[PDB]
Amino acid sequence: SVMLLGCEGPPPGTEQIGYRGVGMENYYNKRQRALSIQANQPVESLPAADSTGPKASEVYQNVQVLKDLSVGEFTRTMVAVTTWVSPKEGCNYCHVPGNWASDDIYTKVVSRRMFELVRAANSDWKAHVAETGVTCYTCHRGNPVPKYAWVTDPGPKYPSGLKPTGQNYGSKTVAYASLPFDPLTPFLDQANEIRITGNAALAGSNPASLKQAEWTFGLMMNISDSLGVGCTFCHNTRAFNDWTQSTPKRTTAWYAIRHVRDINQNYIWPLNDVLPASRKGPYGDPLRVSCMTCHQAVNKPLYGAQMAKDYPGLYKT
Amino acid sequence: PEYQNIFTAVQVRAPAYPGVPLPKGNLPRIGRPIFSYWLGKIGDAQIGPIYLGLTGTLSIFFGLVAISIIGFNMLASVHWDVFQFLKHFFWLGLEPPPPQYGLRIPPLSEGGWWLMAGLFLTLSILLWWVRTYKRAEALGMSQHLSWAFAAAIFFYLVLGFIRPVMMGSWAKAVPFGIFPHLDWTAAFSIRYGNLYYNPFHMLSIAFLYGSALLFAMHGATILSVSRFGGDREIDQITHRGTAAERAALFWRWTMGFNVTMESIHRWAWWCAVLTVITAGIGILLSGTVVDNWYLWAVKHGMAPAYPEVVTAVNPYET
Amino acid sequence: TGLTDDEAKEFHAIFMQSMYAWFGLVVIAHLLAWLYRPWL
Amino acid sequence: TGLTDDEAKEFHAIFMQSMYAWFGLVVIAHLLAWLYRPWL
Amino acid sequence: SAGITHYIDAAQITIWAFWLFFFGLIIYLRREDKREGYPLDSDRTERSGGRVKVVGFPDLPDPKTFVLPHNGGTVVAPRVEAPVAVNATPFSPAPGSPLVPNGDPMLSGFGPAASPDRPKHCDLTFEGLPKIVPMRVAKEFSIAEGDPDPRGMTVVGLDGEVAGTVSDVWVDRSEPQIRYLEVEVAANKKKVLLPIGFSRFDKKARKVKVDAIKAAHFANVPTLSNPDQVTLYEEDKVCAYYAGGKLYATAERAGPLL
Amino acid sequence: FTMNANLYKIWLILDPRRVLVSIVAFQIVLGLLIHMIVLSTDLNWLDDNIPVSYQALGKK
Amino acid sequence: FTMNANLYKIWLILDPRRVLVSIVAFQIVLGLLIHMIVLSTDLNWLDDNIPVSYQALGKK
Amino acid sequence: AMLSFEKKYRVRGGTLIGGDLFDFWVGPFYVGFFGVVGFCFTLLGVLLIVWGATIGPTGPTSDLQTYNLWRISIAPPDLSYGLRMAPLTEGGLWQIITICAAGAFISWALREVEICRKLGIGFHVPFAFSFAIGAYLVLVFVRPLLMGAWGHGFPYGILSHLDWVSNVGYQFLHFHYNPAHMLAISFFFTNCLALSMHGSLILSVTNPQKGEPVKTSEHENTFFRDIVGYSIGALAIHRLGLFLALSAAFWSAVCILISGPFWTRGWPEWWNWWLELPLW
Ligand code: BCL
Ligand code: BCL
Ligand code: BCL
Ligand code: BCL
Ligand SMILES: CC[C@H]1c2cc3[nH]c4c(c3C)C(=O)[C@H](C(=O)OC)c4c3nc(cc4[nH]c(cc(n2)[C@@H]1C)c(C(C)=O)c4C)[C@@H](C)[C@@H]3CCC(=O)OC/C=C(\C)CCC[C@H](C)CCC[C@H](C)CCCC(C)C
Ligand SMILES: CC[C@H]1c2cc3[nH]c4c(c3C)C(=O)[C@H](C(=O)OC)c4c3nc(cc4[nH]c(cc(n2)[C@@H]1C)c(C(C)=O)c4C)[C@@H](C)[C@@H]3CCC(=O)OC/C=C(\C)CCC[C@H](C)CCC[C@H](C)CCCC(C)C
Ligand SMILES: CC(C)=CCC/C(C)=C/CC/C(C)=C\CC/C(C)=C\CC/C(C)=C/CC/C(C)=C/CC/C(C)=C/CC/C(C)=C/CC1=C(C)C(=O)c2ccccc2C1=O
Ligand SMILES: COC1=C(OC)C(=O)C(C/C=C(\C)CC/C=C(\C)CC/C=C(\C)CC/C=C(\C)CC/C=C(\C)CC/C=C(\C)CC/C=C(\C)CCC=C(C)C)=C(C)C1=O
Ligand SMILES: COC(C)(C)C/C=C/C(C)=C/C=C/C(C)=C/C=C/C(C)=C/C=C\C=C(C)\C=C\C=C(C)\C=C\C=C(C)\C=C\CC(C)(C)OC
Ligand code: HEM
Ligand code: HEM
Ligand SMILES: [Ba+2]
Ligand SMILES: [Ba+2]
Ligand SMILES: [Ba+2]
Ligand SMILES: [Ba+2]
Ligand SMILES: [Ba+2]
Ligand SMILES: [Fe+3]
């Protein structure tokens, strides 16, 4: 042996997706479903805060985001942001001791930007986030650094004589498959074309390359894996491009891809100058966002637990 | 109980046989034989001698060159760490020139090795072709192999050489890697709108299933009449025996008609040659003639409709 | 069937009584099954 | 079945007592299982 | 107008081309299928006195000649074969009914015991020496290191009785292998062939089982008109007898089961 | 409602051993079939747990 | 419900080794089978965490 | 009607069941008890596939109803029915048709069995057939069972079953990475090679260049030994081919048996056991 090998027992949990007989179905491990559920547990809310009081911007010195919050509510919001992003470190993580109003430590200029990142998320991307919305926790999980944040990767080494395959390697990025190992930068950072399928049967009006097909395939494998599902979750594989035969999750995923293009482009890249080398990859690019970061292998972060509705301070205006 | 003719239960030896004599021009034969008691457990235990002419040597030569470019490239891709090479081997591969290059001969570091391995591989394959025709002539026999090999070469050429050139892009040929070439297959189907609705690929699939059906049937038959020396198909073909009779009759009583000891080999031959011949046709038309087979099938009303029980609104249209 | 006319009297006897024995165990289990949990 | 009439009384005896022994182990385990965790 | 979509594209017309070549192919293979066994046997032919030779669709292909090597002959297909009586009688006079073999089923040479008349000459090596010959004729041959030598094992029929013992081993001079077992029969010390296909080994016991026939039947094994070689005719005659035991050697292989 | 019984004669026409395994096999199959039918239906006894569903003895 | 004391003759009709090994195979099969059958229902006895969760809270 | 050498073999008996009851021929087909049963299973099956084509998924007047040969399709019930019999017009029909198909194939096999018993030939064919029957059963009986519902079976329709294969395969992201799949594919391919080589050989020797006589066993072996240094030999190639084809069916049956019931994750991920060994 030639060991044998990697295997689950019967019966798997199953779900019918499409019409009977069409083959659109999903299988899953009950064990791992219960463990995943236990690991994707949400932090209970802090009691709502009364008030009825002056606005935060009236009692504090450097409040550029969480303005219209009552003092009480602001305080509540601070306690949540503390346990949510850096509970082992507490208040002092993002503040200059003795001086709550100072921005003299980077983790705060960043915290500020992330208050605008979450607010933007919950109020502008519902076609994506619905009524669950997002919170600090979604990515942080009691951690200062989202465990599942990413960076553009260079692949393994190549002598100077030859250039990288761009694909062809053992990569848990692309589900272990051999497609290209960084299908994120061109799709979840930049906004390259995913579409390769022609809309006409005969040819002469679709320049899509086979290579483009493999890149779309790699990216798709990533996506599938990050939300922890299969193509029948969003598609009808007889026609990947056919939108009417897809599931409303394809629609949601469409809007999500754009959302990650906005998080990575106008909220994370700009923070690259005030962040330390420890938070940067070999090309100087910074740890950014992907679908995994938030979903962490589940179709809805924390199995669609609704955390944000309890904190009004995470919504715009 | 009764022997099944699966395992030679008791074998016998005689001095190895260097074989029927070739006329002048067909060079000596090389190597001197050996017997593997285990091959012998299931088949002729004789290993070789082999023939190697100009053709054969020039083919072994080209072929090993091609295998070296592919391999060396794979070791290079994991940095000459042979451990890593061993670890990702299944995932290692030599990708093709990028499209930016079209059909031009590209730099070493960008695909030129693929074009050289592709070049040398094809030449070595077609030389092995000629080899099998020569080897088939020295014996006065016919070119049935060579017409099949020519069919399989046809598909190969269609995959990595004919379609790429027609499509004006070496990047469309298949890359050398186990898992990589698996991905090329899948990506290939995806890019051209689900290859399942491509009729030629359905026929080729009918012919592959059929090569399995025919060899399974015929093989089962011949073993079932192996008690009558039915395996000795040559003399059952010239002097029909109760083996060829019981054989043809088993099928006659089961499905109503039958063939003969000689003709079943024609059904088999044609069915194998057919896989590769529908297959190549199938690839020939992908991108050159049809770009989206699912669509093609809809245009010819072959694609089924199911109650639309699940659907998604198209964001490109909002 | 290489039986005598009497070894079809004998066999028939053991066969019938045995089959009836089976039917007996059957009425036991179906009886218990109905008592604990009627199905009709 | 290459047995004598003298050796199927003997065999049947051994078969029966052994089989019943099995059924005993079974009834035991079904009893312990029912106690630790009744299933009906 | 630079858009008049044509409804016929290269894939249609190429699938059409395929189907036409296909039909011609099928037909052709079905013609090669009638190079033997044809024209068929009906009571349509006999009722009509013969003006209805049965051949179906397609028709029969012109004879083809096989030129056997070594002064062997010339064979044709399709050919005209002389009818041959049936060693049996209709289980029913109604058509499609089977026939019951006449006499002692294994002797009948009917049913699993039937066989045609192949040449009364021998298959030959490339050189032209009798292909199938015994190891006694084929001096060179030899058992494979680590294989019980069949020579000296006991041949035993289907009901466990000894039949005889292996007196020699016949081999292929063309494709080195055991083709036949020789059996010095116990009951009359006459020599018979036993096809390998009918023989099972019991190596730890040095036995050679035969579910095919009973020990006694070994007495009637068809014989060789020469003990140092065998003819095509004789190979069929030998195997078919054993085959008969598969349905005849017991008053039960006859079936049913229920 | 005619007179001749003596239906023992039945074993003069049908082989007893084969009848035996035929019945034994049929009973085992019919058994698995019926078992599968009731357990896949309402009269089911497994997907219940007495006195309490046991994987709801642990919310945790 | 009483023993026809000529039920030894059953072994004059049915081969002892075959009936025996048949029983062993049938039984071992049913056994492995059932074990999974129960493990597939609510009554699971493996995945319960008794008396304390064995892994951790997570990786820690 | 009979072949010109057939009457001499048309013996009586050999059944498994029926004896003289159905022990007769019809044209060239042998009937027998399993042929009568088979014909019943088959006829009712097909005739029902005909009623399904007649009614369509939404009724005989609906646009989805159809008699177009490419699109007619009878699909299983939803999963909500589990292993119960589902209403006729809700996948029930498919279940019955399935019972008929399985029964017809098993009957067919048993009839080839009675036919082997008659002709006195080996039972290699119906045994081999039984591998396809096995494959069919995992695809309609075993797998959907292990999966708590008959709805996991593939539909009976020319292209709809292709769609089934497609989406079930893609539920695992990249099926090509299924290792049993890789095996099975290799056997189907190798089978296709041996078949093409055997075919070629026989036809290359029994019909040589004009001017040459029927070739010999010596030629046969000398040729493949000339080209590739080995010849497995006549008998064995019939043995190998049977190995390749039956194995191809086998590994297909196991490759699909493990897709669900024994593996739920994507398939390329399986290969993780290889990137994670403590060698690297
Ligand atoms: C709510 C439904 C009830 C239930 C209702 C019933 C009912 C009702 C019946 C059964 C029956 C049986 N059930 Mg239940 N059963 C339940 C749950 C189970 C479970 C389980 C894991 O939960 C199991 C393993 C079983 C298993 C069994 C088998 C012991 C038996 C049928 C076997 C058979 O076909 O005979 C195969 C054929 C044979 C010949 C073997 C018979 C073996 C038995 C033990 C007797 C041995 C005699 C031996 C054969 C004598 C041989 C002679 C010697 C050679 C001389 N049940 C549920 C709880 N079960 C049947 C039964 O037992 O009949 C009384 C029956 O009528
Ligand atoms: C293996 C996974 C899928 C599958 C994969 C594929 C793929 C992939 C393809 C097919 C294709 C087809 N499959 Mg399929 N197929 C499967 C299981 C089956 C079963 C079954 C009951 O088990 C059947 C009957 C069929 C039958 C068929 C035919 C509709 C067609 C060509 C068969 C062929 O040439 O093969 C070789 C066998 C022969 C040549 C023997 C000739 C017998 C003919 C061809 C079969 C007649 C089918 C008949 C038209 C309808 C069934 C009978 C009706 C009940 C009357 N498939 C499984 C479920 N099948 C091919 C196609 O073109 O369909 C679009 C194709 O591309
Ligand atoms: C993955 C997504 C698509 C898919 C996409 C494709 C694509 C794309 C292709 C196929 C191809 C094939 N597919 Mg498909 N296929 C799918 C699903 C299926 C299913 C199924 C049950 O669903 C089946 C049965 C098949 C079956 C088949 C085969 C019938 C067919 C060609 C077989 C072959 O051997 O050619 C292989 C034989 C050869 C290439 C010739 C080999 C000869 C060479 C010269 C040997 C050289 C040896 C070398 C020199 C030795 C040295 C080694 C060096 C290392 C290289 N596909 C799915 C739907 N399929 C072909 C096709 O149909 O195209 C229309 C093809 O290219
Ligand atoms: C779609 C995405 C995945 C895919 C998903 C699947 C799935 C899912 C499956 C396969 C299956 C298989 N795939 Mg695939 N497959 C892919 C790509 C490929 C490629 C390729 C070139 O890339 C190939 C070669 C294959 C090939 C294979 C075969 C190994 C295998 C089917 C064998 C089989 O059915 O035997 C079995 C044969 C039978 C069941 C027929 C039994 C015959 C019965 C008894 C008789 C029928 C009689 C009938 C009535 C005849 C009608 C005649 C009329 C009456 C006259 N796949 C793509 C990548 N593939 C199937 C498999 O794994 O094996 C089952 C399967 O379920
Ligand atoms: C109906 C078409 C089917 C088919 C048919 C087919 N294949 C064929 C043929 C035919 C008719 C041949 O005539 C030919 C053959 O040779 O058959 C045995 C062949 C062939 N099919 C093969 C492969 C093949 N065919 C395939 C497919 C198919 N072939 C279809 C199923 C497949 C697939 C897709 O699975 C494969 C992988 C090869 C065995 C053979 C072609 C071999 C060839 O072209 O050789 C090129 C050169 C080399 C491989 C270099 C030789 C490498 C040596 C092993 C090294 C030895 C070293 C030595 C010790 C010397 C020392 C070195 C010195 C430099 C120091
Ligand atoms: C296992 C190795 C290969 C194999 C072996 C094999 N198949 C065999 C045999 C053997 C040894 C036979 O002896 C037997 C035969 O008779 O030879 C032609 C057979 C057989 N191979 C056949 C088919 C077949 N084998 C296949 C494959 C395989 N069989 C493997 C490749 C395939 C595929 C899918 O590739 C097919 C289609 C049949 C022609 C024949 C068995 C036919 C038979 O048994 O007839 C009785 C049944 C009917 C006449 C029809 C019954 C009617 C049903 C009620 C309706 C059918 C419903 C069906 C389920 C719907 C499917 C719809 C499709 C559109 C999808
Ligand atoms: C309502 C009611 C009363 C009904 C009326 C009855 C009706 C409708 C009658 C119509 C009559 C007709 C036309 C139809 C009957 C249809 C039947 C029952 C079904 C057909 C069943 C059947 C299995 C058909 C399948 C056909 C196909 C193509 C099978 C694939 C196999 C294949 C490629 C076939 C051809 C090649 C064959 C036969 C090879 C067999 C073969 C092999 C394999 C050898 O190795 C061998 C070696 C040495 C000598 C001979 C042989 C040999 O003959
Ligand atoms: C006229 O006769 C002919 C000859 O005779 C002269 C020839 O010599 C020749 C020349 C023939 C050859 C050179 C043969 C060539 C064969 C080739 C190229 C095939 C390639 C095969 C390999 C490389 C070996 C692959 C196989 C293995 C390594 C074994 C692996 C074992 C595995 C996976 C586990 C086994 C278990 C299973 C598969 C599970 C269950 C399987 C079954 C139940 C199958 C049952 C099988 C039988 C046989 C009853 C021809 C063509 C010919 O036609
Ligand atoms: C460390 O390693 C050492 C021993 C050096 C060597 C090791 C070598 C190894 C292990 C190599 C491993 C190789 C493997 C596993 C290769 C696998 C390859 C696979 C699976 C390929 C699959 C498909 C490939 C195809 C179909 C390729 C098609 C390519 C074609 C048809 C190319 C045609 C090109 C031509 C004819 C070139 C024309 C050149 C012209 C003349 C046009 O230029 C002007
Ligand atoms: C319980 C612990 C904490 C307390 C008591 C607390 C308290 C406060 C107070 C009183 C202010 C207003 C100070 C001012 O603007 O003058 C403030 C602002 C702010 N704090 Fe916190 N804080 C806590 C934890 C955190 C954590 C963990 C983060 C980041 C993860 C954070 C990020 C911020 C940011 C960015 C501002 C500026 C707010 C804006 O522009 O809206 N605080 N905090
Ligand atoms: C590994 C299997 C998968 C494959 C092979 C795959 C393949 C593809 C392909 C080829 C396209 C392009 C279709 C076209 O060109 O019009 C596509 C688009 C898309 N897929 Fe996927 N997919 C997979 C899984 C998923 C999953 C799980 C989701 C959702 C979470 C998803 C969501 C989407 C969306 C929204 C689009 C449209 C993107 C756009 O138009 O920019 N796919 N997929
Ligand atoms: Ba899954
Ligand atoms: Ba219940
Ligand atoms: Ba429990
Ligand atoms: Ba633990
Ligand atoms: Ba490690
Ligand atoms: Fe053959």
Curated annotation (Swiss-Prot), chain A:
It is a lipid-anchor. Heme 4 binds at residues 128, 291, 294-295. The keyword Nucleus does not apply. GO terms for molecular function: electron transfer activity; heme binding; iron ion binding. The keyword Metal-binding applies. Heme 2 binds at residues 114, 136, 139-140. A lipid is attached at residue 7 (S-diacylglycerol cysteine). Heme 1 binds at residues 78, 91, 94-95. Its main location: membrane. Heme 3 binds at residues 220, 231, 234-235. A lipid is attached at residue 7 (N-palmitoyl cysteine). It is found in: Cellular chromatophore membrane. Binds 4 heme groups per subunit. Keywords: Electron transport, Heme, Iron, Lipoprotein, Membrane, Metal-binding, Palmitate, Photosynthesis, Reaction center, Signal, Transport. GO terms for biological process: photosynthesis; photosynthesis, light reaction. GO terms for cellular component: plasma membrane light-harvesting complex; plasma membrane-derived chromatophore membrane. The reaction center of purple bacteria contains a tightly bound cytochrome molecule which re-reduces the photo oxidized primary electron donor. Component of the photosynthetic reaction center composed of protein subunits L (PufL), M (PufM), H (PuhA) and cytochrome C (PufC). The reaction center interacts with light-harvesting antenna complex LH1. This is Photosynthetic reaction center cytochrome c subunit. The chain holds residues 17 to 333 of 404 of the full protein.
